[PDB]
Each structure stands twice: as structure tokens, then as C-alpha cells.
């Protein structure tokens, strides 16, 4: 599990393996007093680009616990068809509701 | 275009002599009242269509 | 089963066989690479054209598996009737709802 109060020590894999009702509360628990005599690798602010790379990670893990609640989505805009000779791409302006009941 | 296609038409047709002039007065001069430029036709691919 | 990345496979009883439910599908998950080593005897135009015929003999069958729902199809305008001696042909404006329960 991720320190939060650390500088090195988050990581892409703690941060995908916790799940996204659990980054609430592991952070929200987390220490004011930063500590500052063993800092993160890449500087202050390259741990910050290395917290984003699992929550970007972590949203395709969530559209597999949703997978079975919306369809597959058909394409947004043209251009995109295998068969663009008798026919043309549509493009799904999308204002349809995806849901599984 | 007719509504009798089994009382087909290629020389006769069905339409009053006020048809198309009623065309003309709805394509030439009611559209452009609407355009202020901003209408233009199209040719149809009627296979794409 | 006619392959939609070479032209010289379209017929027209390839196509009517297919329902219209099923041509949706099979046009968007085609392979792009359009090939150019078979190519059509009525021209590439003219295999537009044999796949267009194959759509339309095929509204039919759509159409005869909703012969349960639809009405009698009405004499839209007048000239269509039998007995005009007395009574003229009428002309039903086909406003309708074509459901049957």
C-alpha cells in the first residue's frame, strides 16, 4: 500500500492495484507533516506525474466492472467504416442512453 | 413522381400548368428569402443513398 | 457467405438471403484493406449495383416476417377499384398505425 506523505513512494503499481472506493479514504487518512530527508527520485514534482499513471489505469479497470452495465460503443465520427464505397461512415452524435438492464 | 404509376406517363402528365411555376415561386424566391446566401443544392449518389 | 473485401463475391441471391437485421453488423466489421487482385465483370460500378438490388429484393423478406402486424395494404389513391359504375375509387390516406396485436 501507498504512503501518501512520502515523496518516494508511490508508484503506477500501488496506485492500480488499490481499487478506486479505496484511493478515497487512503488519502484521506494520510499525514500533514511532510517528510523531506529522502525525497522521490524524479524531484518533487516528477512524483506527481507518477500518481496520474494509475488512476488513467484505473478507469479501464472500472469499464470492466461496468462492462456489463453499458453496450460497445459504435463510432462518434466519420470516416471511420471498412465499407466506404457503397455507403457512407455515420458518426454517433451519442445521446443514447447506454444501459444493460 | 405520379400517384398512378399503373396509369403510367411519359408524354401525358398529371400535374396543373401552375405546378412547376408554384416550384418556381417556392425554389427561385422563397428559399432565398430565407437564405441571405446560405442555401446550395446537392447531386445525390443514389447508390450511396 | 459473401466476403465484403472483394467485389467479384456480391450476388444478388447472396444478398437477399441476408436479413437486413445482419447487414448492419457485417458492413462495420469488415477488414479496411480494400484488395485489387479480383475485380468485377459489370465493372466496379456495377457491383454497387448487384448489392443494391440484393437490398431491395431483400425488404421483402423483412417485410413477410412482419406479415403478422402490418394491415391490408389500402388503395392509397383513386383509379384503384374494381366496380366504378356507381361509386368511384377512393383514395386512403395511409395515416394510419399498421399494428395488429
Given at each position: 500500500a501507498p504512503q501518501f506523505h512520502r515523496p518516494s513512494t508511490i508508484t503506477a503499481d500501488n496506485v492500480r492495484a488499490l481499487g478506486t472506493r479505496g484511493l478515497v479514504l487512503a488519502t484521506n487518512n494520510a499525514q500533514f507533516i511532510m517528510d523531506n530527508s529522502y525525497p522521490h527520485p524524479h524531484g518533487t514534482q516528477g512524483a506527481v506525474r507518477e500518481f496520474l499513471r494509475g488512476q488513467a489505469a484505473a478507469l479501464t479497470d472500472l469499464g470492466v466492472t461496468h462492462a456489463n452495465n453499458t453496450f460497445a460503443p459504435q463510432p462518434?465520427?466519420?470516416?471511420?467504416?471498412?465499407?466506404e464505397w457503397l455507403r457512407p461512415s455515420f458518426g454517433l452524435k451519442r445521446t443514447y442512453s447506454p444501459f444493460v438492464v | 413522381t405520379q400517384a398512378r404509376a399503373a396509369d403510367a406517363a411519359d408524354d401525358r402528365?398529371?400535374?396543373?400548368?401552375?405546378w412547376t411555376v408554384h416550384h418556381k415561386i417556392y425554389y427561385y424566391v422563397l428559399v432565398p428569402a430565407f437564405s441571405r446566401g446560405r442555401c446550395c443544392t446537392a447531386g445525390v449518389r443514389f447508390d450511396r443513398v
Open positions: 462518434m465520427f466519420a470516416g471511420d467504416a471498412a465499407a | 402528365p398529371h400535374r396543373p400548368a401552375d
